[PDB]
Amino acid sequence: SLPDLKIEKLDEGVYVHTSFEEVNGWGVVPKHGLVVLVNAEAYLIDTPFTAKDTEKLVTWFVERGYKIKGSISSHFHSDSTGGIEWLNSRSIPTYASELTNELLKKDGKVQATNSFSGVNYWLVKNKIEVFYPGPGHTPDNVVVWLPERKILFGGCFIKPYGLGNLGDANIEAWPKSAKLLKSKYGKAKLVVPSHSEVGDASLLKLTLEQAVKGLNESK
Numbered sequence: 001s002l003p004d005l006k007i008e009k010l011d012e013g014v015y016v017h018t019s020f021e022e023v024n025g026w027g028v029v030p031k032h033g034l035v036v037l038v039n040a041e042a043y044l045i046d047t048p049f050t051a052k053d054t055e056k057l058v059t060w061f062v063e064r065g066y067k068i069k070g071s072i073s074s075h076f077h078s079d080s081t082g083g084i085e086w087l088n089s090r091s092i093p094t095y096a097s098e099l100t101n102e103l104l105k106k107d108g109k110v111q112a113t114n115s116f117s118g119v120n121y122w123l124v125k126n127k128i129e130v131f132y133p134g135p136g137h138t139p140d141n142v143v144v145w146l147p148e149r150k151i152l153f154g155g156c157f158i159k160p161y162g163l164g165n166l167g168d169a170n171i172e173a174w175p176k177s178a179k180l181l182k183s184k185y186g187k188a189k190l191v192v193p194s195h196s197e198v199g200d201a202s203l204l205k206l207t208l209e210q211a212v213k214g215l216n217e218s219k
C-alpha cells in the first residue's frame with residue numbers, strides 16, 4: 001500500500017533516504033533523512049519511521065561495502081527516531097541530544113546510546129556537525145550541517161509551505177529560531193527538509209515566513 005523506501009544520491013558522499021508512513025490527517029507522509037559517507041563509513045542522519053525500513057537502509061549500504069558507524073536523530077518524534085531500537089540491537093552507535101533522549105524517555109520510547117549537549121556538536125569532526133537553533137517544530141529540534149558540501153539537513157524545522165504537526169511545536173520561539181538559522185546557514189547550497197522537497201537557501205526564508213505567519217494566526 002505505502003510506497004517503498006527510496007535512496008537517491010544528493011551530492012558526493014551524500015544520499016537522501018525517503019520512507020513513507022500513513023499518519024491520520026496528513027495521509028501518506030514522506031520523511032527525508034540522509035546517509036553521509038565519510039571514507040568507507042556510513043552515518044545515518046535520522047532513521048526511517050520503522051525498524052523494517054531502517055534495516056533495509058542499513059543493508060543497502062552494507063551491501064555496497066560501507067559499515068554503519070553511527071546514526072543521529074534530529075528530534076524526538078518517531079519519524080526521526082523510529083529505527084533507534086533496531087540500531088541499538090545491532091550495536092550501531094546512536095546519537096541524540098540530551099533533551100531529545102529526555103523527551104524519548106518521557107514518551108516511553110527507546111533512547112539513543114549516546115548523547116551530546118550544547119548548541120554545537122561534531123558527530124564527525126569537520127564532516128558532520130550538529131547545531132541547535134532554538135525551539136521550533138519541537139523543543140529539541142536540531143539541524144545537521146555538512147561543511148564540505150554546504151548541505152544543511154533541516155529536519156522537521158524547515159517548513160516552507162506550512163508548519164505541519166504543531167502538537168509539540170513552540171510557535172512563539174520558532175520565528176526567532178528560524179531567523180537565527182537563516183543568518184547562520186545563508187550560504188547553504190542545499191537545504192533538505194523532513195517532509196518537503198530539497199531546495200536552496202531560500203527555504204530558510206520561506207520557513208521564517210511560515211513561522212511568523214503561524215505565530216500571528218494564533219492570536
Ligand SMILES: O=C(O)c1cccc(-n2cc(Cc3ccccc3)nn2)c1C(=O)O
Binds near residue numbers: 028030079
Ligand atoms: O515530524 C512530525 O512531527 C510530523 C509527523 C507527520 C507529519 C508532519 N508534517 C506534516 C506537514 C504538512 C503536510 C501536509 C500534507 C502532506 C504532508 C505534509 N509537514 N510535516 C510532521 C512534521 O510537522 O514534521
Ligand SMILES: [Zn+2]
Binds near residue numbers: 077
Ligand atoms: Zn516531528
Ligand SMILES: [Zn+2]
Binds near residue numbers: 156194195
Ligand atoms: Zn517530521
